[PDB]
RNA sequence: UGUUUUUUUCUGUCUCGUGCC
């Protein structure tokens, strides 16, 4: 639903990188270069930005008030 | 007495108000009443779209943009 | 009937990781030092969250779970504070804990991104990794929601929970050329060469060596951001020394008692 | 919810991803399993052996 | 002196509901309404 | 709640230690005076979840959390059913930490 | 519901001894050292350090059950060298080696920074 | 009543006393889904009141 | 020349469906 704070296998902090990953994919960069531009060398931490689904947006669509 | 003065669109009844207006328009066979109901529904839809755009200006819109360019 | 004189040589010293080499030592000592790097390293982390009003969409426990994984810099604080279990007082005393506070409420129309920056700590040096790169996103709030809470941090080690695991991943490797035959490749030509392999590109693996001990153990301790890598190594070695000393004291007491 | 935009669905505590097509009886999602049977108005000639007839023209 | 404060369904407006009363909101008028978070010491361990 | 009979009648109310004859050996002051537990409150196995008492003085005809559940109340909703009686639903969450024996595939 | 806590892996319980010595009866000069609330970290290094000593005829540990936190170390030395002093010497000199490794690593770090 | 463990390994947890005796008392932990039997002297009442009421 | 309390295993019906070894 939301980006984890650390990689399950390794433990490197990946929570502070989803927004930056989206921005780098936004500008011109593609995934294969964005991942190593962010600083993810091991393949275990790269699933956190590829396999993650961002379901918090749909949840936020159901605003309680206003 | 509360809803008499209290304006209706606020806040979560936007879909309910739109459905009620559409039902009233369909039920009413008159021309002026149907036109007024259609205009009210269009105004409510525009207000809802503007409110969503203001709320979804960041993140919710950028994620759509990145998804569309990625596909 | 005594031990050896190991040597150390740092190949790369940065503020994110260190690559050092230990020579003239036994494999068991190297593996134990690695496992201490991962498990038994004192470090401060969030372990007690008091939530007063959480109107977000996620679970009540989800906030605490995410807050527990936020690293906290403890360069000179972990050595001073004492374990909460061994404290001699009541309530989380600042002498043996660090207090945190978070009070964010999305008032404007746009959605909020509650990051680790909102954690206002009472102590100056105990802060999340934001000093000197974006911040760890905790949750997302929308107009009408809020998140008020206060948490306390304590000292722990990875053996208790993964929140106290400073090292990201330790790249432990010894004997790059398969000289001791500790692994048998069915087709050596099909394997790539190790990063630290000194052999040329022609031969696939070094020849067999009967009278050969494992030495020259390579390390790539990678800090998550809380503790410095060399600081991690020093703390781990000091903890292993303390454990050895305590074991020796207990053994001496047991022998004298008999 | 006939041809209704995702905005209203989200505002009505629903999702656009729900396939739908299920009744709601006493607050419980009820679905009708599609039963299959033998096609009508078609002549079938079986050869039941555990009987006195060699062939049977069912329809 | 607790008047059992409740929260409306869609309007999310605070309502004071006592025993032997219909469960309806002070304006508009609906039938769905939730309760408020307890005032107890909700303390979790971030484990 | 529902009207069982001319003399029988259900109502949400904390079953006290004095007036209610039928009663369980469990904690009751955990919930508020309405008879519905507040959200975000500790419950465990064999704990009162709703304060229903039927008059015969009253009988504790209230349900309890099933044994070996040990969860937390998420939210409490109250309404009327088609008949017009007070109808309420309560859901209890539980953080299931993955432990050995859980089935994976 | 009955998952054990996290502190029962390192913290001693009231009445539980950190180390217990038990002499074996099958062969002379052989004792089994039972360590409580520890893992392979504190047994493998001692095993290897004992292996270095030539007077130690037998040296090796085990884990009776992974969920349970205990290790048994069996030591057998020459009849003119008790296993208690063997264990003490191994611990002492291992501590010395670790301290020397610390000092060398520290000086290497301090030299590496701008040097 | 709500109590708080002030000494021992569980120092810091919050729970409600389920069954109490002359020496020990069972307290259900808030976070974890498990009930422990900690000594009564290890507990400290914190209570949960609501001052005001006007 | 004096010192205020003793009550305790309850309990629920018949039917249908789904999943697992
Ligand atoms: Zn990884
Ligand atoms: Zn203290
Ligand atoms: Zn109403």
Swiss-Prot record, chain B:
Residues 29-63 form a coiled coil. Disulfide bonds: none annotated. It is found in: Nucleus, Nucleoplasm. The Plus3 domain mediates single-stranded DNA-binding. Component of the PAF1 complex, which consists of CDC73, PAF1, LEO1, CTR9, RTF1 and SKIC8; the association of RTF1 appears to be less stable than that of other subunits. At least in HeLa cells a N-terminal shorter form of RTF1 is also found in the complex. The PAF1 complex interacts with PHF5A. Component of the PAF1 complex (PAF1C) which has multiple functions during transcription by RNA polymerase II and is implicated in regulation of development and maintenance of embryonic stem cell pluripotency. PAF1C associates with RNA polymerase II through interaction with POLR2A CTD non-phosphorylated and 'Ser-2'- and 'Ser-5'-phosphorylated forms and is involved in transcriptional elongation, acting both independently and synergistically with TCEA1 and in cooperation with the DSIF complex and HTATSF1. PAF1C is required for transcription of Hox and Wnt target genes. This is RNA polymerase-associated protein RTF1 homolog. The lineage of its organism: Eukaryota, Metazoa, Chordata, Craniata, Vertebrata. The chain holds residues 498 to 568 of 710 of the full protein.
From Swiss-Prot, chain H:
It is found in: Nucleus. Methylated by PRMT1/HRMT1L2 and PRMT5/SKB1. Methylation negatively regulates interaction with P-TEFb and RNA polymerase II. Phosphorylated by CDK7 and CDK9. Phosphorylation by P-TEFb (CDK9) at Thr residues of the C-terminal repeats alleviates transcriptional pausing and promotes transcription elongation. Dephosphorylated by the INTAC complex when transcripts are unfavorably configured for transcriptional elongation, leading to premature transcription termination: dephosphorylation is mediated by the PPP2CA component of the INTAC complex. Dephosphorylated by the PNUTS-PP1 complex in termination zones downstream of poly(A) sites, thereby promoting deceleration of RNA polymerase II transcription. CTR repeats lie at residues 47-52. Ubiquitously expressed. It comes from the Eukaryota. Residues 1-30 form the KOW domain. Component of the DRB sensitivity-inducing factor complex (DSIF complex), which regulates mRNA processing and transcription elongation by RNA polymerase II. DSIF positively regulates mRNA capping by stimulating the mRNA guanylyltransferase activity of RNGTT/CAP1A. DSIF also acts cooperatively with the negative elongation factor complex (NELF complex) to enhance transcriptional pausing at sites proximal to the promoter. Transcriptional pausing may facilitate the assembly of an elongation competent RNA polymerase II complex. This is Transcription elongation factor SPT5. It comes from Homo sapiens (Human). The gene is SUPT5H. The chain holds residues 708 to 761 of 1087 of the full protein.
């Amino acid at each position: 639903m939301i980006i984890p704070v650390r990689c399950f296998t390794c433990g490197k902090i990946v929570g502070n990188k989803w927004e930056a990953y989206l921005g780098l994919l936004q500008a011109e960069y593609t995934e294969g270069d964005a991942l190593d531009a962010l600083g993810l060398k091991r393949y275990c931490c790269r699933r956190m930005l590829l396999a993650h689904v961002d379901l918090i947006e749909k949840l936020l669509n159901y605003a309680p008030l206003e | 007495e509360k809803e008499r003065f209290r304006k209706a669109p606020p806040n979560y009844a936007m879909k309910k108000t739109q459905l009620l207006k559409e039902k009233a328009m369909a039920e009413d066979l008159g021309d002026q009443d149907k036109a007024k109901q259609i205009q009210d529904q269009l105004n409510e839809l525009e207000e809802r779209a503007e409110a969503l755009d203001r709320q979804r200006t960041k993140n919710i819109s950028a994620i759509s943009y990145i998804n569309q360019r990625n596909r | 009937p005594y031990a050896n004189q190991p040597t150390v040589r740092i190949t790369e010293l940065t503020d994110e990781n260190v690559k050092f080499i230990i020579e003239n030592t036994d494999l068991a000592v190297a593996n134990s030092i690695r496992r201490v790097f991962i498990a038994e390293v004192p470090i401060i982390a969030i372990d007690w969250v008091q939530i007063d009003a959480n109107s977000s969409v996620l679970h009540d426990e989800f906030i605490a779970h995410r807050l527990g994984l936020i690293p906290l810099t403890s360069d000179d604080i972990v050595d001073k504070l004492q374990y909460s279990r061994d404290c001699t007082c009541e309530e989380f005393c600042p002498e043996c804990s660090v207090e945190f506070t978070l009070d964010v409420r999305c008032n404007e129309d746009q959605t909020r991104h509650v990051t680790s920056r909102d954690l206002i700590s009472n102590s100056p040096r105990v802060i999340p990794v934001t000093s000197r790169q974006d911040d760890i996103l905790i949750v997302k709030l929308r107009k009408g929601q809020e998140l008020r809470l206060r948490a306390y941090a304590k000292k722990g080690f990875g053996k208790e929970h993964a929140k106290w695991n400073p090292t990201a991943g330790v790249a432990f490797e010894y004997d790059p050329d398969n000289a001791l035959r500790h692994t048998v490749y069915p087709k050596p030509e099909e394997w790539p060469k190790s990063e630290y392999s000194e052999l040329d590109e022609d031969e696939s693996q070094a020849p067999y060596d009967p009278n050969g001990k494992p030495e020259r153990f390579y390390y790539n301790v990678e800090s998550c951001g809380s503790l410095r890598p060399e600081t991690i190594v020093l703390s781990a070695l000091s903890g292993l020394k303390k454990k050895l000393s305590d074991l020796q004291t207990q053994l001496s007491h047991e022998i004298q008692s008999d | 919810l006939n041809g209704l935009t995702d905005r209203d669905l989200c505002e009505l505590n629903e999702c656009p991803l729900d396939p739908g097509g299920y009744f709601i009886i006493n607050g419980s999602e009820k679905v009708l399993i599609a039963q299959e049977k033998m096609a009508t108005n078609t002549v079938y000639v079986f050869a039941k052996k555990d009987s006195k007839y060699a062939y049977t023209g069912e329809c | 002196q607790q008047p059992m404060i409740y929260i409306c369904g869609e309007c999310h407006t605070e309502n004071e509901i006592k025993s032997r009363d219909p469960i309806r909101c002070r304006e508009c008028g609906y039938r769905i309404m939730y309760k408020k978070r307890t005032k107890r010491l909700v303390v979790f361990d971030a484990r | 709640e529902s009207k069982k009979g001319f003399d029988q009648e259900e109502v949400f109310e904390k079953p006290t230690r004095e007036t209610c004859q039928g009663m369980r050996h469990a904690i009751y002051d955990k919930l508020d005076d309405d008879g519905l537990i507040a959200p975000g409150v500790r419950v465990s196995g064999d704990d009162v979840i709703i304060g229903k008492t039927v008059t015969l003085t009253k009988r504790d005809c209230s349900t309890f959390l099933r044994t070996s559940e040990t969860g937390i109340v998420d939210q409490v909703m109250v309404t009327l059913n088609q008949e017009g009686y007070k109808f309420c639903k309560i859901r209890v969450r539980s953080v299931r930490i993955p432990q050995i024996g859980d089935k994976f595939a | 519901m009955n998952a054990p806590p996290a502190f029962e892996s390192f913290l001693l319980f009231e009445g539980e001894k950190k180390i217990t010595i038990n002499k074996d009866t099958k062969v002379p000069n052989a004792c089994l050292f039972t360590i409580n609330k520890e893992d392979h970290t504190l047994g493998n290094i001692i095993k290897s350090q004992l292996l270095k000593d030539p007077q130690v005829l037998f040296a090796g540990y085990k884990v009776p059950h992974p969920l349970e936190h205990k290790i048994i170390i069996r030591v057998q030395t020459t009849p003119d060298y008790s296993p208690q002093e063997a264990f003490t010497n191994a611990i002492t000199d291992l501590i010395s080696e670790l301290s020397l490794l610390e000092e060398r690593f520290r000086v290497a770090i301090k030299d590496k920074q701008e040097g | 009543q709500t109590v708080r463990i002030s000494q021992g390994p569980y120092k810091g947890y919050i729970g409600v006393v389920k069954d109490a005796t002359e020496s020990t008392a069972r307290v259900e932990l808030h976070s974890t889904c498990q009930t422990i039997s900690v000594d009564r002297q290890r507990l400290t009442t914190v209570g949960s009141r609501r001052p005001g009421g006007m």
